[PDB]
Design a protein around this motif. Structure first.
Motif, PDB file in Angstrom:
ATOM      1  N   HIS A   1     -80.572 -45.310  -5.593  1.00 52.17           N
ATOM      2  CA  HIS A   1     -80.961 -44.164  -4.812  1.00 52.17           C
ATOM      3  C   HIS A   1     -82.097 -44.153  -3.914  1.00 52.17           C
ATOM      4  CE1 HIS A   1     -79.405 -43.118  -8.871  1.00 52.17           C
ATOM      5  NE2 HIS A   1     -78.362 -42.832  -8.206  1.00 52.17           N
ATOM      6  N   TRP A   2     -81.948 -44.468  -2.493  1.00 48.22           N
ATOM      7  CA  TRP A   2     -83.285 -44.455  -1.686  1.00 48.22           C
ATOM      8  C   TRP A   2     -83.449 -43.309  -1.246  1.00 48.22           C
ATOM      9  CZ3 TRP A   2     -80.457 -48.262  -2.875  1.00 48.22           C
ATOM     10  CH2 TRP A   2     -81.043 -49.681  -2.949  1.00 48.22           C
ATOM     11  N   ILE A   3     -84.564 -42.529  -1.660  1.00 49.12           N
ATOM     12  CA  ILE A   3     -84.813 -41.211  -1.332  1.00 49.12           C
ATOM     13  C   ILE A   3     -85.799 -41.060  -0.295  1.00 49.12           C
ATOM     14  CG2 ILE A   3     -85.385 -38.948  -2.443  1.00 49.12           C
ATOM     15  CD1 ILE A   3     -82.670 -40.598  -3.357  1.00 49.12           C
ATOM     16  N   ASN A   4     -85.418 -40.121   0.744  1.00 47.63           N
ATOM     17  CA  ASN A   4     -86.229 -39.776   1.668  1.00 47.63           C
ATOM     18  C   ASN A   4     -87.627 -39.096   1.286  1.00 47.63           C
ATOM     19  OD1 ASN A   4     -86.998 -39.519   4.524  1.00 47.63           O
ATOM     20  ND2 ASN A   4     -86.439 -37.378   4.571  1.00 47.63           N
TER      21      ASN A   4
ATOM     22  N   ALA B   1     -80.472 -44.320   1.375  1.00 48.55           N
ATOM     23  CA  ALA B   1     -79.488 -45.139   1.045  1.00 48.55           C
ATOM     24  C   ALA B   1     -78.992 -44.979  -0.409  1.00 48.55           C
ATOM     25  CB  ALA B   1     -80.073 -46.872   1.053  1.00 48.55           C
ATOM     26  N   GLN B   2     -77.840 -45.399  -0.773  1.00 51.49           N
ATOM     27  CA  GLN B   2     -77.223 -45.448  -1.998  1.00 51.49           C
ATOM     28  C   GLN B   2     -76.625 -46.701  -2.305  1.00 51.49           C
ATOM     29  OE1 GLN B   2     -73.706 -45.442  -3.209  1.00 51.49           O
ATOM     30  NE2 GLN B   2     -74.458 -45.465  -5.288  1.00 51.49           N
ATOM     31  N   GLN B   3     -77.136 -47.430  -3.256  1.00 52.67           N
ATOM     32  CA  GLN B   3     -76.169 -48.714  -3.768  1.00 52.67           C
ATOM     33  C   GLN B   3     -75.660 -48.493  -4.978  1.00 52.67           C
ATOM     34  OE1 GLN B   3     -74.409 -51.831  -3.489  1.00 52.67           O
ATOM     35  NE2 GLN B   3     -75.577 -51.228  -1.753  1.00 52.67           N
ATOM     36  N   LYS B   4     -74.504 -48.682  -4.991  1.00 51.59           N
ATOM     37  CA  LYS B   4     -73.851 -48.882  -6.490  1.00 51.59           C
ATOM     38  C   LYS B   4     -73.601 -50.517  -6.440  1.00 51.59           C
ATOM     39  CE  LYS B   4     -70.407 -47.709  -9.741  1.00 51.59           C
ATOM     40  NZ  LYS B   4     -71.738 -47.639 -10.243  1.00 51.59           N
TER      41      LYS B   4
ATOM     42  N   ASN C   1     -88.554 -46.066   0.826  1.00 56.46           N
ATOM     43  CA  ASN C   1     -88.073 -44.747   0.429  1.00 56.46           C
ATOM     44  C   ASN C   1     -88.379 -44.930  -0.882  1.00 56.46           C
ATOM     45  OD1 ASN C   1     -85.732 -45.002   2.836  1.00 56.46           O
ATOM     46  ND2 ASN C   1     -86.609 -43.241   2.394  1.00 56.46           N
ATOM     47  N   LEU C   2     -88.140 -43.969  -1.831  1.00 56.32           N
ATOM     48  CA  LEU C   2     -88.118 -43.692  -3.038  1.00 56.32           C
ATOM     49  C   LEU C   2     -86.986 -44.022  -3.521  1.00 56.32           C
ATOM     50  CD1 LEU C   2     -90.189 -42.817  -5.226  1.00 56.32           C
ATOM     51  CD2 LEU C   2     -89.073 -40.653  -5.256  1.00 56.32           C
ATOM     52  N   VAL C   3     -86.915 -45.520  -4.214  1.00 54.39           N
ATOM     53  CA  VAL C   3     -85.934 -46.242  -4.907  1.00 54.39           C
ATOM     54  C   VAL C   3     -85.796 -45.859  -6.499  1.00 54.39           C
ATOM     55  CG1 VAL C   3     -84.519 -48.257  -4.956  1.00 54.39           C
ATOM     56  CG2 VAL C   3     -86.496 -47.969  -3.328  1.00 54.39           C
ATOM     57  N   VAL C   4     -84.494 -45.591  -6.766  1.00 53.43           N
ATOM     58  CA  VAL C   4     -84.543 -45.284  -8.257  1.00 53.43           C
ATOM     59  C   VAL C   4     -83.106 -45.430  -8.585  1.00 53.43           C
ATOM     60  CG1 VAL C   4     -84.168 -42.787  -7.695  1.00 53.43           C
ATOM     61  CG2 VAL C   4     -84.337 -43.568 -10.079  1.00 53.43           C
ATOM     62  N   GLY C   5     -82.625 -46.360  -9.884  1.00 56.61           N
ATOM     63  CA  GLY C   5     -81.203 -46.457 -10.198  1.00 56.61           C
ATOM     64  C   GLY C   5     -80.877 -45.527 -11.101  1.00 56.61           C
ATOM     65  N   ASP C   6     -79.664 -45.722 -11.746  1.00 59.71           N
ATOM     66  CA  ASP C   6     -79.259 -44.948 -12.885  1.00 59.71           C
ATOM     67  C   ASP C   6     -78.317 -45.706 -13.872  1.00 59.71           C
ATOM     68  OD1 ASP C   6     -76.805 -44.919 -11.322  1.00 59.71           O
ATOM     69  OD2 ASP C   6     -77.059 -42.958 -10.683  1.00 59.71           O
ATOM     70  N   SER C   7     -77.958 -45.190 -14.782  1.00 58.32           N
ATOM     71  CA  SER C   7     -76.975 -45.863 -15.807  1.00 58.32           C
ATOM     72  C   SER C   7     -75.790 -45.681 -15.184  1.00 58.32           C
ATOM     73  CB  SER C   7     -77.291 -45.227 -17.395  1.00 58.32           C
ATOM     74  OG  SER C   7     -78.404 -45.032 -17.354  1.00 58.32           O
TER      75      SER C   7
ATOM     76  N   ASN D   1     -76.141 -44.218   3.595  1.00 61.05           N
ATOM     77  CA  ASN D   1     -76.483 -45.756   3.633  1.00 61.05           C
ATOM     78  C   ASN D   1     -77.099 -45.925   4.925  1.00 61.05           C
ATOM     79  OD1 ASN D   1     -75.535 -46.943   1.300  1.00 61.05           O
ATOM     80  ND2 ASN D   1     -73.316 -46.117   2.086  1.00 61.05           N
ATOM     81  N   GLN D   2     -78.277 -44.986   5.366  1.00 60.93           N
ATOM     82  CA  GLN D   2     -78.831 -45.298   6.532  1.00 60.93           C
ATOM     83  C   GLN D   2     -79.651 -46.403   6.819  1.00 60.93           C
ATOM     84  OE1 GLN D   2     -79.909 -40.523   5.257  1.00 60.93           O
ATOM     85  NE2 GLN D   2     -81.249 -41.697   6.782  1.00 60.93           N
ATOM     86  N   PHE D   3     -80.198 -46.796   5.859  1.00 58.50           N
ATOM     87  CA  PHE D   3     -80.666 -48.414   5.660  1.00 58.50           C
ATOM     88  C   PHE D   3     -79.791 -49.198   4.618  1.00 58.50           C
ATOM     89  CE2 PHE D   3     -83.541 -46.809   8.498  1.00 58.50           C
ATOM     90  CZ  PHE D   3     -84.706 -46.083   7.905  1.00 58.50           C
TER      91      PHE D   3
END
Lengths: 371, 87, 783, 59, 218
Positions: free
Chosen positions: A326-329, A337-340, A315-321, A19-21
């Motif tokens: 997921h904010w990827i370096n 960052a990770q957001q649930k 960042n590379l952002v991607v969700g999942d089911s 969760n860096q940002f």
């Protein structure tokens, strides 16, 4: 049942949380049975400061993209026919082009919903329901439908410009081809692990190019759903085969500039020379445009339920089911960052539009996401 | 027999009245076999003799029969259409 | 270089010369350097060879063959739902087995084909791993490793191109059932694409019978859903714009049976088209020509579907054969039974034409045999004239003999025992015998029962039955009950129709009694006999010789005699006495067993098994009390104990039974419980009404190679037995069974276990409501 | 332990084909002789020697 | 039992459990002899010992497979004289078997299925090895094998005489005729076809048989 039916293989839910940002939602505006757990290429867009949202068995919304509060809502749950109050059943995405919301539906039918109210600004049934979302472009409603048809309707009334056949499946080889327009040609992927270009004027095949493997004697899994869509860097087409084999190839001829017949990729973006991608095991890699030079990679996403990845908030952002974002370096592979923000989770294309980052989740639906 | 019910006994490989008209004295076995086929009984040690016999028993009553014997020569050329009724 | 000696290293399974003949250069051949390399590869054509190192010692060949011969085993792991033999079939498909030319090159090709087999199951989410593991000196094991993730299942059916017919009714036609709820639980699931093709025609015939005679399916798109289970399917169809069957113009080689053919083409011109009806109507003609001898009933049609009036016109092109096709017949599968008893179980005669039904009707009688495993035939057209079709009656025969239990004192309380067994045509000779009997201190029972079912060729059933019941119920071998009974039953089988059949016989029963109980139903019968002994003692005797007359009748249009599933057989039977009998009475009955298919594929069939019976005196007398009707225990109201369901009598005020023993067998006696004690056992009534309703249940967890003759079934069991001659004044303070409403209740399941000496029916029934005097053993083991 | 009934259990068998005998052959008059043998009912009657029945050896 | 051992150690125990009467072990020996070494020097004699272990343990189809195996392992072998006889001797024993023989119950009107198979192989013996020690045996089997087929086919001509399909009588009798002349049951079928003739008013054709009866009186 509970201690008897058990036989599973590997999966990772969420390794590497960061969760860096610190990610949030820009607003939450959950619509209903939206995208759904059901696999269908209905997915939202973001335009007009309006979350033009949808339920795929019910209400087609429009919500003010500041807070996601309603602009309008209609229901395409078709109320009569030989099926008599069938639900909305949308195969193609929320294509909001101009004053219409074009949506390929699972009636093999394409409703253009008038963006002001949601009245069907036109409807027109197509040959097969939309395997790919309607690429409404150049007067044409360019759709790779389920039967491997490229249809082109008029985007003002549905007047059919043509219907041509694409690279065929064998059963229904759901190669999302999403027929783009480049160099005056309706540039379009495949289903048999092929790719092509046909004309944007009438669907006249510029070239058909077999890339790689499909079902039958070099078979690939039921999980294979691989978006064979051309991302054309106009001289060089970048597209996938149905087994996910990455390919740089010509547009005038389809002659392979290079191909990763080593890639088995699901989602792919060509960010300059930084080809960020999602493999079959939801494994992330940054390739180059000369070949498969791994700029970086990631198994922080590995055996996931990922969406398409997007550059947003640096960042590379991607969700999942699984409901994790997921904010990827983009430097290398790590969660920034990770957001649930949901648990019904995401398979939509995240819409980094209207300045926002719009997703409709499956049933825990539409969220705008920011950090 | 003081029983009026008898389950009826039947037997074919016979000739109809249409069958006798298909053939006449002079026709070979083959000519008869093109007309009637070959019966399910012929003369095993004698000449070409084609036995087409009907048999049927009714309940508590007397058994019916239509024997129609097709006696040829050795060449098979028909020589005798030997019809024989019941009794 | 020319070799003087080839050195053949490493040889186990293939020969030295079989290697040498596989060598392009033999020992002494003109040897070339590529031939040495050809000696490498052409030895690898054995398939048993890992390495072939053809070296030469100047010219002297040294061929160091390393071998992969006979695969000395193949082992499996992780295939819970998958038979290893099916995987061995894939090894049989990939040309590899235990003891075979090992190929480690096809390992993934196995596992691909294993997955491509795991494809064809209806999965793909599964792991596959052929592991080549060595066995003695060069041999191998093929270890097979599986992690089966998930199959595929019916999820969604998209039908576009339909214009009238709702997919909900179409899935209701198809076997694409995909709903088993949690509080509305019904049905099942789990896709297979082999069902799918029939489900395509379940649509198509359903459009064909509607009139849709231009119906076609355009295309079909079954979703390769990214989950490795998901089966959605888009089908594209062209509905077929309904047509009218509007005229039949049947012709061809009609064989002069044209009017009878026209009866089979009695149609409505103009009703909505039904090619399925057209389809079977041709087969009626194929039966009609099949009736008239023509076993070549080439009957094809043309539905000239007229799309201008939206109709159909029916050209039908007919060709018959010849009549006398039934030339001779063959009978096979009677290696232990008689051939001719099967031949007289047949209706079509040789030296005749084809009666198309009679082979099947004879097979139906052979289906009604039940001493068979299979009823089938082979109907061989012998080449020659069109009067040559011979018929092999290929049939398989089933088990013989079945002992009946109930025996035991530990085999330690004297010489007391129970027997009982059946003979089952007496080894297929033609004599079904069933014999039981028991000699104890409490009885000496004798019985035989034999039929010559074909005493004459019609089916005169010479059914000879005997008995001798020296029933000697023991208190001192007297003083409990005495009855020595003995006699016969010769009863005969009658043809009435070919599914109708009468029974009639006569009976000898000489009962010889002593020390008779005080209970009223005896004594009300005793006084109906006009015999009035003293009831305070069991001092009372009785000598009777009742001469009765047996009669009956049987229907027969139910399938099998060992495992039926559809139809019924009516069992009317009864008895009455003669002038000269020592008691003037009657006893009549009827028993039912209907087989109604719940599932018409017969995995669920109603088995309505009911029982009726009535018997009284002919006037001035009564039916004997031992002829009263009983239930419970093993009966069709089970879970009880035997003879617990029925009327309940009371002992008269009683004393010594000629010395009733010291507090034993209390019968209102002097030794315990004197002066109108009661009998709570089912003394039975003059009326019988008992039933069982059973329902065929499939067994999925069993190897169905033998569960196919295992019939598990559920039931409720209920019934009432009562006496219409029952008293309500001497049973005023007692169970009255003058009323018909004496209805018992029970429920449960039976398990017929197919054992090699006959099936074994074991049942747990549970009496829900039990009426007056019922006694229970819920767990009953039967035959 | 068995009287008239062969203790130490076994299963029934057959060798009576050698132990049997032929019957009377046909002698039919002229014109009444049909051909009366088909197939291997024409026995390939060869008696190149060696033991018969139970006397015959078994390798 | 008996894994990849010396084959003669497998073979000695094979010959031992043959001579032990442990055929069920000797089968498992001679299998494990050829499960490991089907290329043994006595692997044909294994098949001769297998059938010997099969037949003494009453394993006729296992013998019959080993009979087929001996053909497929050595179709040129002179010990087919055993094996083709054993092919009959399987099929002579494979046909009918019941305990009713002490009661004298005939099984020649039972199905002659493997009797028809033993009708081939015993004749294929005395064709293929017309000189063997089994040849004098198998020919006399064929004498009763046609006579077992006589009372098989006699049992049905009576039935058709009881049936009254008189064409079906004369078909079984002529089949009784046109196979075996050497059976009295055909000469007892001789009035039956003639009676069937006499029921079919082929009294004259029956009188042809009546002189055959006059000729087959002796």
């Amino acid at each position: 049942l509970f201690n008897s039916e058990e036989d599973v293989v590997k999966m990772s839910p969420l390794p590497t949380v960061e969760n860096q940002f610190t990610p949030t939602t820009a607003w939450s505006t959950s619509v209903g049975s939206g995208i759904g757990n059901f696999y269908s290429n209905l997915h939202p867009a973001l335009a007009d400061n309006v979350v033009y949202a949808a339920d795929r068995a019910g209400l087609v919304k429009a919500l003010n993209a500041d807070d996601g509060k309603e602009i309008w809502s209609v229901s395409l749950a078709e109320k009569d026919g030989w099926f008599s109050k069938e639900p909305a059943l949308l195969s193609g995405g929320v294509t909001v082009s101009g004053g219409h919301v074009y949506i390929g539906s699972e009636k093999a039918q394409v409703y253009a919903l008038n963006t002001s109210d949601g009245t069907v600004a036109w409807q027109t049934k197509v040959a097969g329901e939309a395997l790919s979302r309607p690429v409404v472009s150049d007067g044409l409603v360019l759709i790779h439908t389920s039967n491997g048809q490229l249809q082109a309707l008029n985007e003002a009334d549905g007047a059919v410009k043509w219907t041509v056949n694409l690279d065929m499946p064998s059963l229904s080889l759901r190669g999302e081809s999403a027929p783009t327009t480049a160099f005056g040609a309706a540039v379009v992927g495949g289903d048999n692990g092929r790719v092509s270009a046909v004309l944007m004027e009438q669907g006249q095949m510029i070239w058909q190019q077999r890339i790689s493997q499909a079902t039958g004697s070099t078979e690939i899994d039921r999980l294979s759903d691989v978006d064979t869509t051309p991302v054309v860097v106009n001289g060089v087409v970048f597209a996938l085969a149905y087994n996910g084999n990455l390919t740089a190839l010509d547009l005038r001829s389809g002659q392979i500039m290079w191909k990763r017949e080593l890639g088995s990729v699901n989602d792919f973006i060509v960010d300059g020379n930084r080809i960020y991608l999602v493999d079959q095991n939801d494994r992330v890699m940054a390739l180059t445009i000369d070949g498969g030079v791994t700029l970086w990679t990631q198994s922080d996403l590995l055996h996931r339920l990922l969406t398409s990845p997007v550059l947003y908030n640096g960042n590379l952002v991607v969700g999942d089911s699984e409901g994790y974002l997921h904010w990827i370096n983009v430097e290398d592979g790590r969660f920034v960052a990770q957001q649930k923000v949901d648990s019904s989770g995401f398979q939509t294309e995240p819409v980094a539009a209207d300045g926002k980052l719009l997703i409709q989740a499956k049933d825990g639906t539409v969220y705008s996401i920011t950090r | 027999e003081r029983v009026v019910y008898r389950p009826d006994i039947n037997q074919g490989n016979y000739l109809t009245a249409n069958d006798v008209s298909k053939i006449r004295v002079g026709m070979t076995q083959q000519q008869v076999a093109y007309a009637l086929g070959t019966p399910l009984m012929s003369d095993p040690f004698g000449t070409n003799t084609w036995f087409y016999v009907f048999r049927q028993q009714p309940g508590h009553e007397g058994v019916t029969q239509q024997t129609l014997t097709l006696t040829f020569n050795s060449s098979g050329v028909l020589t005798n259409i030997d019809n024989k009724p019941a009794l | 270089f020319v070799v003087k000696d080839i050195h053949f290293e490493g040889l186990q399974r293939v020969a030295v010369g079989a290697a040498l003949l596989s060598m392009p250069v033999r020992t002494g051949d003109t040897v070339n350097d590529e031939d040495i390399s050809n000696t490498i590869r052409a030895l690898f054509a054995t398939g048993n060879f890992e390495d072939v190192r053809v070296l030469r010692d100047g010219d002297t060949l040294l061929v160091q063959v390393k071998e992969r011969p006979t695969i000395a085993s193949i082992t499996f792991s992780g295939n819970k739902s998958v038979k290893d033999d099916m995987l061995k079939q894939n090894l049989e498909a990939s040309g590899v087995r235990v003891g075979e030319s090992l190929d480690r090159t096809t390992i993934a090709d196995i596992e691909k084909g294993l997955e491509d087999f795991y494809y064809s199951v209806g999965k793909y989410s599964a792991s596959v791993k052929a592991v080549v593991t060595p066995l003695p000196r060069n041999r191998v094991d093929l270890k097979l490793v599986f992690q089966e993730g998930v199959s595929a299942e019916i999820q969604q059916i998209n039908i576009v191109g339909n214009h009238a017919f709702t997919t909900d009714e179409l899935i209701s036609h198809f076997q694409l059932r995909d709903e088993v709820p949690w509080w509305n639980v019904v049905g099942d699931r789990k896709y297979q694409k082999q069902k799918l093709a029939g489900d395509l025609e379940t649509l198509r015939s359903y459009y064909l019978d509607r009139g849709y005679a231009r119906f076609n399916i355009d295309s079909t798109q079954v979703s390769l859903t990214p989950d490795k289970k998901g089966i959605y399917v888009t089908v594209n169809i062209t509905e077929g714009d309904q047509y009218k069957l509007s005229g039949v113009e049947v012709s061809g080689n009609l064989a002069g049976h044209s009017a009878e053919i026209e009866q089979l083409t009695k149609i409505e011109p103009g009703e909505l088209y039904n090619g399925t009806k057209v389809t079977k109507m041709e087969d009626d003609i194929k039966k009609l020509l099949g009736r008239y001898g023509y076993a070549y009933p080439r009957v094809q049609s043309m539905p000239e579907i007229n799309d201008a009036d939206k109709t159909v016109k029916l050209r039908v092109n007919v060709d018959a054969g010849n009549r006398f096709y039934v030339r001779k017949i063959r009978f096979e599968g009677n290696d232990t039974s008689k051939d001719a008893v099967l031949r007289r179980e047949m209706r079509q005669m040789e030296g005749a034409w084809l009666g198309s039904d009679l082979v099947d009707q004879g097979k139906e009688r052979l289906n009604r045999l039940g001493f068979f495993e299979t009823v089938d035939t082979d109907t061989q057209r012998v080449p020659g004239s069109p009067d040559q079709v011979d018929v092999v009656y290929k049939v398989k025969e089933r088990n013989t003999g079945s002992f009946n239990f109930g025996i035991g004192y530990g085999t330690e309380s004297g010489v007391s025992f129970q027997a009982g067994v059946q003979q089952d045509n007496w080894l297929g000779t033609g004599y079904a015998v069933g014999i039981n009997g028991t000699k104890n201190d409490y009885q000496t029972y004798a019985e035989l029962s034999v039929t010559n079912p074909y005493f004459t060729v019609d089916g005169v059933s010479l059914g000879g039955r005997l008995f001798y019941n020296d029933f000697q119920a023991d208190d001192a071998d007297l003083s409990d009950y005495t009855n020595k009974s003995y006699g016969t039953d010769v009863t005969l089988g009658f043809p009435i129709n070919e599914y109708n059949s009468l029974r009639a016989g006569l009976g000898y029963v000489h009962n010889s009694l002593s020390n008779m109980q005080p209970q009223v139903a005896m004594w009300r019968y005793l006084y109906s006999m006009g015999e009035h002994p003293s009831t305070s003692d069991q001092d009372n005797s009785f000598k009777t010789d009742d001469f009765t007359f047996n009669y009956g009748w049987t229907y027969n249009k139910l399938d099998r005699g060992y495992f039926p599933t559809d139809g019924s057989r009516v069992n009317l039977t009864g008895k009455v006495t003669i002038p000269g009998s020592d008691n003037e009475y009657y006893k009549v009955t009827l028993d039912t067993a209907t087989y109604v298919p719940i599932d018409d594929d017969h995995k669920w069939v109603v088995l309505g098994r009911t029982r009726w019976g009535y018997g009284d005196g002919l006037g001035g007398k009564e039916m004997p009390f031992y002829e009263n009707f009983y239930a419970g225990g093993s009966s069709t109201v089970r879970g009880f104990q035997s003879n617990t369901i029925g009327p309940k009598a009371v002992y008269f005020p009683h004393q010594a039974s000629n010395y009733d023993p010291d507090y034993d067998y209390e019968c209102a006696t002097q030794d315990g419980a004197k002066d109108l004690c009661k009998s709570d056992d089912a003394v039975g009534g003059n009326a019988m009404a008992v039933a069982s309703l059973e329902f065929i249940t499939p067994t999925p967890f069993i190897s169905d190679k033998y569960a196919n003759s295992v019939r598990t079934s559920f039931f409720w069991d209920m019934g009432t037995v009562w006496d219409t001659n029952w008293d309500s004044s001497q049973y005023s303070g007692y169970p009255d069974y003058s009323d018909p409403s004496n209805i018992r209740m029970s429920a449960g399941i039976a398990l017929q276990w197919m054992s090699p000496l006959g099936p074994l029916v074991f049942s747990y029934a549970q009496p829900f409501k039990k009426y007056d005097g019922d006694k229970a053993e819920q767990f009953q083991f039967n035959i | 332990c068995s009287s008239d009934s062969r203790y130490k259990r076994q299963v029934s068998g057959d060798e009576a084909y050698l132990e049997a005998a032929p019957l009377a052959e046909l002698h039919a008059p002229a014109g009444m002789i049909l051909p009366v043998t088909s197939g291997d009912y024409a026995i390939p009657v060869t008696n190149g020697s060696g033991a018969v029945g139970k006397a015959l050896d078994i390798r | 039992e008996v894994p990849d051992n010396p084959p003669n150690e497998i073979y000695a125990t094979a010959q031992q459990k043959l001579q032990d009467g442990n055929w069920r072990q000797a089968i498992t020996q001679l299998e494990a002899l050829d499960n490991r070494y089907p290329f043994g020097p006595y692997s044909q004699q294994v098949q001769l010992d297998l059938i010997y272990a099969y037949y003494k343990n009453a394993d006729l189809p296992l013998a019959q497979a080993a009979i087929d195996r001996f053909i497929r392992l050595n179709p040129t072998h002179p010990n087919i004289d055993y094996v083709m006889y054993m092919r009959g001797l399987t099929n002579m024993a494979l046909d009918d078997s019941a305990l009713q023989g002490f009661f004298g119950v005939d099984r020649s009107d039972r199905d002659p299925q493997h009797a028809r198979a033993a009708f081939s192989d015993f004749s294929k013996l005395v064709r293929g090895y017309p000189n063997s020690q089994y040849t004098t045996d198998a020919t006399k089997r064929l004498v009763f094998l046609k006579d077992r087929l006589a009372k098989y086919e006699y049992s049905v001509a009576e039935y058709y005489t009881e049936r009254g399909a008189w064409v079906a009588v004369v078909n079984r009798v002529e089949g009784m005729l046109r196979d075996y002349p050497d059976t009295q049951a055909t000469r007892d079928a001789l009035p039956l076809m003639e009676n069937a003739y006499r029921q079919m008013q082929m009294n004259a054709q029956a009188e042809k048989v009546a002189k055959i009866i006059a000729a087959n009186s002796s």
